């Protein structure tokens, strides 16, 4: 926690000369307003004005005027005078928070969750990213930074070792890193965080993306969170380990049952499974995202839960006690953390307050099953394209309730425009398959 | 020996900021989990969790959850804040060691050996490696770092001397180096270690491979332990000098016989010769390995033992006293040290407890002998391909007992898949010989 006096003291002792008022849009892009430190007081008075329509992304029409209200607890100084940042909420000219701000939407969802008796919603993300080599002109190529495998000690200590530098710099900034390892695909890396509250977790995800992209550029590399940059290799996921708490106590832990899961946890996973098609578009917002949702690369392709399976939509880790959690594995690093977390929490709460019955967990004898038999058993498939994902999202009420009307409509319009632009392109695959056979 | 307090003191005084929890899979690849030093306590409590299925290599199916238990005696700090490492055993969620971990398998084999009255199994390896030049893009080429010969003083003193730097860095790390020399083939090098106990010897082999690969990259070179990188020149071997000890005393030494070999040593070498075809696949796990097992390059090609021969499978060095040992020369540096050592020890113990009679040693009049006469005498040939090596391994019970059912089955599946992928390739040799003659 910080106050105005703490911020002034930090600016004075650390010789901060630049301030970044940081926020996000509906597409998850990290936006910021740059300010000289001489404006610090005006920053602390919630008097900084900006367009505000930039939150709409590429579907903005008219310039508005909106105020930035910094959150003093998000204060941090970058290790590169010095530059400091503050994460700010967006307010309208009438003093009320802007309904199109994902952070405010997540805060509203958490506040409405608190009326159900729960106090905290903790998230631990597992973001995976790719590192590509840069060419002479400074553009990213398709060559990977290394050639390691799953949990390999591929980047040696002598040389670049971008992952180690990223971890150390995040530790210096005040982050809580659990562990890091090399991912399955060459040039793919994963850094894991300790669990934190929802808003703090999403802020940490945004800051982690920014820090990774900066440090990769320091090492003459390019960091990408693209869900599927390369065909034929593993994609990048952002698995969300979530846990509910109502007062110094995990609501998912059952200390008496051998399995160790309460009825609340079963209702939560049932609700997430019920509305999985509804929030797939939000959790997988890019056209490329659905190139990751293909079988054989551990990404989930159908709606099921298990404790031990190759690619379940929901996985329950063997940890118990205060660390019991539910892992949603459909999220990719390109998704907006606030919107995806709000959608997942809303689906879980919808399952909780409807007392839904969780279906049977899947086991090893599902690998031999076509889609027809899978549907006969009751296992629905995730949408395979962004078009069908938007079609499914337009038919779900829980996702609309989670997002709010403004964010829901803007996201649908943006994604429809993006798909419309994508669908008219003639791909090289078509020119290879056709143009000689026809 | 080290304790928790020693580790904390070392971290505090040396300013260790990064920890590598190091382990290995069934393919011998050095795997690791990276951790910030702030997690040190959680590391020392055996509470670090990871996939565990990575031990299976490329035949893993479902993600598991397994714990890492570090061995405090393996603590060492790399000379490149600082980075430290700890070699960890893999434990299941039920508190028992994972049966698929090669290190635990070797420990179990040693424990069962201790019931026969023997206390220690000392190993001294002779790993050989190649150094290739890197191109502008940083990829390895086929040009060697020097053009020296057997025991040559090729990289004299000034400019790279990669072997000297490797030896000095290993000495600074606390290793025990006996001697180093240039190998027969150009760009080929060998570094010899003093004998150590089995687990320590295999850990030293893994650390040596990691250190060599790091330092070669430091010198703009590429170090490879591939058994036969180049056709027409010598391959790289990892000859194992092994010795048995039952209490401050070498069990292979006979102080009265002028040969100086105990009947126990003869039984051990008889057992190793008997099951040589059984463990050839484990000691030579790559397809390329059997390109080294060709006549004319000192690699063993048939099953025989001698005290003076060009390429015997087992060699008995002239040293006696406490340093008498048996050298198995079929092992290559690409083999997993734990699995190969366990297989060799199990074969030796099988010979010991069956009181097998060692065949007559071979001498100079075997060079003029075809395979028919060699088989008539009683000299069997080693498997010539990985396919036939797997066929022979499937017919040996000693190798299965040495490896354990889990490791045996996973290794067989992995190698069968690898051979199946290799056999469908059309080689450049086939395109050179055919396509014009047919």
């Amino acid at each position: 926690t910080f106050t105005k006096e703490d911020i002034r003291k930090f600016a004075e002792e650390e010789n901060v000369r630049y301030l970044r008022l940081q926020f996000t849009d509906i597409l998850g892009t990290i936006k910021n307003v740059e300010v000289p430190v001489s404006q610090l007081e005006k920053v602390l008075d919630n008097e900084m004005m900006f367009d505000g329509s930039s939150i709409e992304g590429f579907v903005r029409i008219e310039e508005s005027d909106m105020y930035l209200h910094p959150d003093l607890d998000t204060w941090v100084i970058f290790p590169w005078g010095k530059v400091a940042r503050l994460i700010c909420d967006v307010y309208k000219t009438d003093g009320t928070p802007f309904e199109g701000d994902p952070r405010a939407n997540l805060k509203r969802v958490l506040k409405e969750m608190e009326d159900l008796g729960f106090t905290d919603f903790n998230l631990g993300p597992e973001p995976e990213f790719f590192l590509f080599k840069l060419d002479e002109k400074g553009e990213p190529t398709l060559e990977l930074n290394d050639d390691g495998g799953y949990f390999d000690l591929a980047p040696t200590d002598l040389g670049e070792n971008c992952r180690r530098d990223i971890v150390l710099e995040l530790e210096d900034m005040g982050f809580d890193i659990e562990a890091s390892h090399h991912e399955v695909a060459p040039g793919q890396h994963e850094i894991d965080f300790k669990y934190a509250d929802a808003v703090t977790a999403c802020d940490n995800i945004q800051t982690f993306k920014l820090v990774v992209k900066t440090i990769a550029r320091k090492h003459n590399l390019h960091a990408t969170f693209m869900p599927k940059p390369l065909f034929g290799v593993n994609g990048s996921g952002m698995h969300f380990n979530v846990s509910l708490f109502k007062g110094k106590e995990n609501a998912f832990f059952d200390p008496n049952t051998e399995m160790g899961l309460t009825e609340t946890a079963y209702q939560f996973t049932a609700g997430v499974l019920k509305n999985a098609r509804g929030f797939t578009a939000v959790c997988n917002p890019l056209v490329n995202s659905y190139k990751r949702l293909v079988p054989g690369y551990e990404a989930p392709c159908y709606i099921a839960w298990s404790g031990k399976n190759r690619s379940p939509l929901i996985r329950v880790p063997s940890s118990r006690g205060l660390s019991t959690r539910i892992e949603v594995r459909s999220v990719d690093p390109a998704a907006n953390p606030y919107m995806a977390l709000a959608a997942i929490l809303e689906a879980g709460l919808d399952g909780i307050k409807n007392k839904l019955k969780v279906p049977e967990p899947v086991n090893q004898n599902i690998y031999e099953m076509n889609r027809e038999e899978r549907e006969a058993v009751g296992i629905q498939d995730l949408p395979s394209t962004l078009y069908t994902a938007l079609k499914a999202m337009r038919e779900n009420e829980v996702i609309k309730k989670a997002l709010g009307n403004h964010i829901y409509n803007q996201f649908i319009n943006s994604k429809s425009i993006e798909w419309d632009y994508y669908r008219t392109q003639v791909s090289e695959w078509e020119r290879d398959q056709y143009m000689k056979q026809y | 020996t080290f304790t928790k307090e020693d580790i904390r003191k070392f971290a505090e005084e040396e300013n260790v900021r990064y920890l590598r929890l190091q382990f290995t899979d069934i393919l011998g690849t050095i795997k690791n989990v990276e951790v910030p030093v702030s997690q040190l306590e959680k590391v020392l409590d055996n509470e670090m969790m990871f996939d565990g299925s990575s031990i299976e290599g490329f035949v893993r199916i479902e993600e598991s959850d397994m714990y890492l238990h570090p061995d405090l005696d393996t603590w060492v700090i790399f000379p490149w804040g600082k980075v430290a490492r700890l070699i960890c055993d893999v434990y299941k969620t039920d508190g028992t060691p994972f049966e698929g971990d090669p290190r635990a398998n070797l420990k179990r084999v040693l424990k069962e050996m201790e019931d026969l009255g023997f206390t220690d199994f000392n190993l001294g390896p002779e790993p050989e490696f190649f150094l290739f030049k890197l191109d502008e893009k940083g990829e390895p080429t086929l040009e060697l770092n020097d053009d020296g010969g057997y025991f040559d003083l090729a990289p004299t003193d000034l400019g790279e001397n990669c072997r000297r730097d490797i030896v000095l860095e290993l000495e600074d790390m606390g290793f025990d180096i006996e001697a180093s020399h240039h190998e027969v083939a150009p760009g080929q090098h060998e570094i010899d270690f003093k004998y150590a106990d089995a687990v320590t010897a295999c850990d030293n082999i893994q650390t040596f491979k990691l250190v060599v690969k790091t330092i070669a990259r430091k010198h703009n070179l590429h170090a490879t332990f591939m058994p036969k990188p180049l056709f027409g020149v010598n391959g790289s071997g990892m000859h194992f000098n092994v010795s048995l000890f039952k209490g401050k005393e070498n069990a292979f030494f006979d102080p009265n016989t002028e040969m100086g070999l105990t009947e126990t040593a003869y039984q051990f070498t008889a057992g190793v010769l008997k099951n040589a075809r059984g463990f050839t696949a484990v000691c030579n796990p790559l397809v390329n390995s059997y390109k080294r097992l060709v006549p004319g390059y000192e690699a063993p090609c048939y099953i025989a033992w001698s005290g003076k021969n060009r390429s015997p499978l087992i060699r008995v060095p002239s040293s006696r006293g406490l340093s008498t040992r048996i050298e198995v020369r079929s092992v290559d540096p690409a083999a997993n040290p734990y699995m190969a050592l366990a297989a060799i020890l199990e074969a030796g113990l099988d010979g010991i407890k069956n009181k097998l009679k060692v065949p007559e040693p071979v001498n100079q009049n075997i060079y003029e002998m075809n395979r028919e006469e060699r088989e008539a005498v009683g000299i069997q040939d080693l498997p010539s391909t990985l396919y036939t090596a797997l066929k022979a391994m499937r017919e040996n019970e000693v190798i299965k007992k040495a490896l354990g059912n889990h490791i045996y089955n996973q290794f067989i599946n992995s190698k069968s898949i690898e051979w199946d992928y290799y056999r469908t390739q059309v080689s450049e040799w086939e395109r050179d010989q055919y396509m014009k003659q047919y």
Binding site: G149, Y150, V184, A185, G232, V233, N234, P295, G296, Y297, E298, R310, Y367 | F58, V59, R60, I61, I417, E418, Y421
Partner: peptide, 11 residues
């Protein structure tokens, strides 16, 4: 193959 992602080295 079920584990296509783990066999990417061979393909």
């Amino acid at each position: 193959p079920i584990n296509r992602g783990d066999l990417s080295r061979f393909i």
